[PDB]
Ligand binder design. Structure first.
Ligand SMILES: *[C@@H]1O[C@H](CO)[C@@H](O[C@@H]2O[C@H](CO)[C@@H](O)[C@H](O)[C@H]2NC(C)=O)[C@H](O)[C@H]1NC(C)=O
Ligand SMILES: *[C@@H]1O[C@H](CO)[C@@H](O[C@@H]2O[C@H](CO)[C@@H](O)[C@H](O)[C@H]2NC(C)=O)[C@H](O)[C@H]1NC(C)=O
Ligand SMILES: [Cu+2]
Ligand SMILES: [Cu+2]
Ligand SMILES: [Cu+2]
Ligand SMILES: [Cu+2]
Length: 497
């Protein structure tokens, strides 16, 4: 069952074996992935998170972010550790009490402390629309139509050795899949459909790192939502999905009753499908209980290309139709060297005092805010443009902005900008060497909003900045509850800070 919009959520340690290999984990709701948190557009969510963690090898503190939810007036509930809060300590709980006006779509939640989400604290978050403009395109949309794609590691996140390459050991689809090495025939996930019906499949990348080439043998996929934003229908036969992105697609159960492979090929780790790695099963009701015998094509006919997506609504693009045609046009220098990432020459290292608390205590320019050089002010009620030219090692980097979605004025692998009708989304691949992926948004949400690469290993290695949006109005806009004010004193006492 789905939980929410008002629910407790306990964070625990447990052993799991999603690929047949047992290791300890950090879990929400006792499962990997965590349970789906759900409600309707405009609802009040009150997620009371109970930190019951005891194993220090995966950190006993925690903090949870609600990815893609704008948190307008509730910046204190956003979750990134040392940006909007101090972590919750073990044996304590905290009510993330917020509303979701004006949003409906497919989201997710995850730890936002260190690399802890990799250790298991990740799950879907769905905001349904009772009046969805896409409702007539499908028959079924429920917990059985959510498809999560996850990387899974045998080595614990905190225990990944400094200086060795990090790759995953299994792809997990709906929490199950097989290991790339020492492969055993552990159970695969089954997604069940009925011949003749149409399904809103909600595809969620909960990845810590790889992008996936997602397909379903014999089928095609009609995209209707991108990172929470309704799209015009776009039919594809493969989706390259980067860390933290979401798509809804209509699956028409229009093939013969049978079994079909579901494929999710990561860009690192095991290549191919030998032994059933990188695989799940689409099973029609009435099919034999057996593995598919289908194959992929050598070449996909209609892969997703980001510039083909367009909003369902008339969203346009703010600003003027040329580079730099914004009130605050920025170009970030994104670099990597010697194990650390940097933005405009500064590698992100989380501060002792969360950025929001520094602002509430009266620090009112961004040059005043710690970490020095990592916090950039944005003016209120202004069009912002951010060019994110690629080239830094470890790409392609999926950049994500908290508090906002954005127009993707320029996409990967295509030098032509689109000032007319590009898709809006919240996580975008910045592409390859020489690219100039560029985003635009308007500043109508006071507070400090993290901008970072969503490859968690890269965030940990410093690939982030904070946009302190409308510093002057942050305090008035974001009244804080006592429990939030209590977090940093409790954390600092527990840690002798
Ligand atoms: C990406 O686009 C930005 C603009 O959105 C380019 O920024 C210009 O950079 C040159 C130096 O390279 C400056 O003289 C300009 O002031 C910048 N802004 C403009 C023209 O609006 C940037 O060069 C582009 N980067 C790449 C790699 O293509
Ligand atoms: C590269 O990106 C551009 C801009 O998004 C794409 O150009 C659009 O193409 C559509 C479809 O033919 C036209 O309706 C638009 O008028 C174009 N807009 C602009 C600003 O040129 C282009 O299709 C993309 N290239 C590829 C190969 O997909
Ligand atoms: Cu996220
Ligand atoms: Cu986010
Ligand atoms: Cu990255
Ligand atoms: Cu983040």
């Amino acid at each position: 069952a789905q939980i929410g919009p008002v629910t407790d959520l306990h964070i625990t340690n447990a052993n799991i074996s999603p690929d047949g290999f047992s290791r300890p984990a950090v879990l929400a709701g006792g499962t990997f992935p965590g349970p789906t948190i759900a409600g309707n557009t405009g609802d009040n969510f009150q997620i009371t998170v109970f930190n019951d963690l005891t194993d220090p090898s995966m950190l006993t503190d925690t903090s949870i972010h609600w990815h893609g939810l704008f948190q307008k007036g509730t910046n204190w509930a956003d979750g990134p550790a040392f940006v909007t809060q101090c972590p919750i300590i073990t044996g304590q709980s905290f009510d993330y009490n917020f509303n979701v006006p004006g949003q409906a779509g497919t989201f997710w939640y995850h730890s936002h402390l260190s690399t802890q989400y990799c250790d298991g604290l990740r799950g879907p978050f769905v905001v349904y629309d009772p009046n969805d403009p896409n409702a007539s395109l499908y028959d079924v949309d429920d917990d059985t139509t959510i498809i999560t794609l996850a990387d899974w590691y045998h080595t614990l996140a905190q225990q990944e050795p400094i200086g060795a390459a990090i790759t995953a050991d299994a792809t997990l689809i709906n929490g199950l899949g097989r290991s790339f090495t020492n492969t055993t025939a552990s159970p695969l996930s089954v997604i069940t459909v009925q011949s003749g019906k149409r399904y809103r499949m909600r595809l969620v990348s909960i990845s810590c790192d790889p992008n996936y080439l997602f397909s379903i043998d014999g089928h095609d996929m009609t995209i209707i939502e991108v990172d929470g934003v309704n799209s015009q229908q776009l039919t594809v036969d493969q989706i390259q999905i980067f860390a933290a992105q979401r798509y809804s697609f209509v699956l028409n159960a229009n093939q013969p009753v049978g079994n079909y492979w579901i494929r999710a090929q990561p860009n690192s780790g095991g290549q191919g499908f030998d032994g059933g790695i990188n695989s799940a099963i689409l099973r029609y009701e009435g099919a034999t209980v057996e593995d598919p015998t289908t194959t992929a094509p050598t070449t996909f006919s209609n892969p997703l290309v980001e510039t083909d997506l367009h909003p369902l609504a008339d969203l346009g693009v703010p600003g003027q139709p040329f580079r730099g045609g914004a009130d605050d046009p920025l170009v970030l220098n994104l670099a990597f060297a010697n194990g650390r990432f940097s933005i405009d020459g500064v590698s992100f290292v989380p501060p002792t005092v969360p950025v929001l608390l520094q602002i509430l205590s009266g620090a009112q320019n961004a040059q005043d805010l710690l970490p020095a050089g990592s916090v950039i002010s944005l003016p209120s009620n202004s069009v912002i443009e951010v060019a994110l030219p690629a080239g830094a090692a470890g790409g392609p980097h999926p950049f994500h902005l908290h508090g906002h979605n954005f127009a993707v004025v320029q996409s990967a692998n295509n030098a032509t900008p689109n000032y007319v009708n590009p898709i809006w989304r919240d996580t975008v691949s910045i592409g390859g060497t020489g690219d100039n992926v560029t985003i635009r948004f308007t500043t109508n949400n006071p507070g400090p909003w993290f901008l970072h690469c969503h490859i968690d290993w890269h965030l940990e290695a410093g690939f982030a900045i904070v946009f302190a949006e409308d510093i002057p109005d942050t305090a008035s806009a974001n009244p804080v509850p006592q429990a939030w004010s209590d977090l940093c004193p409790a954390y600092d006492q527990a840690h002798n800070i």
